[PDB]
Amino acid sequence: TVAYIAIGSNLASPLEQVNAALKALGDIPESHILTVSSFYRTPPLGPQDQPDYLNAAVALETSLAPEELLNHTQRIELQQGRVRKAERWGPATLDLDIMLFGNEVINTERLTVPHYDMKNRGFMLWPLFEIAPELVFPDGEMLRQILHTRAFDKLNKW
Ligand SMILES: Nc1ncnc2c1ncn2[C@@H]1O[C@H](COP(=O)(O)CP(=O)(O)OP(=O)(O)O)[C@@H](O)[C@H]1O
Ligand SMILES: Nc1nc2c(c(=O)[nH]1)N=C(CO)CN2
Ligand SMILES: [Cl-]
Ligand SMILES: [Mg+2]
Ligand SMILES: [Mg+2]
């Protein structure tokens, strides 16, 4: 199955973090990277006392179960120093979010797929569209169409 993973970093030299994350994603067992997006510099959504993000997306072919893939993305986050604080949508050395897991719909305590907010976020949809322009969401909507309709600002390269 192809999993689409959003990558964000706004602490501790985001370019180095995203390069490290890509290497580590490629080291996840029973998986392989298919496609990587460009790197974009995006203003923070949420609290404004934080740096701009590097945002990217990757397509990862995997035979892992979705929660097992999450275990591995979370491990990578911790290998790159991720800390979490009370404030919602605070900064991160590395944030790996599962946007889509094939065409699945997943509703569990640990995992909600499609990612709950991705359709509202150019910093997620634009990198996804670069690597999967023909993508169709589980609800039947086309990514390309959503982007044209919502008319989110185009992103700047990192
Ligand atoms: N699609 C998904 N991808 C990654 N985590 C998901 C997820 N759906 C639910 N999670 C859960 O989200 C929990 C908190 O992860 P965080 O990384 O702190 C949220 P965040 O990425 O900072 O905000 P965001 O989800 O609004 O982008 C994880 O412990 C995980 O169980
Ligand atoms: N620009 C940008 N803003 C964000 C991002 C992100 O990836 N990019 N992630 C958040 C929570 O994970 C909160 N805010
Ligand atoms: Cl959907
Ligand atoms: Mg996250
Ligand atoms: Mg996130």
Curated annotation (Swiss-Prot):
Which pathway? Cofactor biosynthesis; tetrahydrofolate biosynthesis; 2-amino-4-hydroxy-6-hydroxymethyl-7,8-dihydropteridine diphosphate from 7,8-dihydroneopterin triphosphate: step 4/4
The effect of temperature on activity is:
Thermostable. Retains 75% of its activity after heating 30 minutes at 96 degrees Celsius.
GO MF term set? 2-amino-4-hydroxy-6-hydroxymethyldihydropteridine diphosphokinase activity; ATP binding; kinase activity; magnesium ion binding
**Origin: domain of life:** Bacteria
**Pfam families from the UniProt entry:** HPPK (PF01288)
Q: What is its EC number?
A: 2.7.6.3
The family classification in the record reads: Belongs to the HPPK family.
Q: How does it assemble?
A: Monomer.
Q: What does this protein do?
A: Catalyzes the transfer of pyrophosphate from adenosine triphosphate (ATP) to 6-hydroxymethyl-7,8-dihydropterin, an enzymatic step in folate biosynthesis pathway.
Record protein name field:
2-amino-4-hydroxy-6-hydroxymethyldihydropteridine pyrophosphokinase
Q: Which organism is it from?
A: Escherichia coli (strain K12)
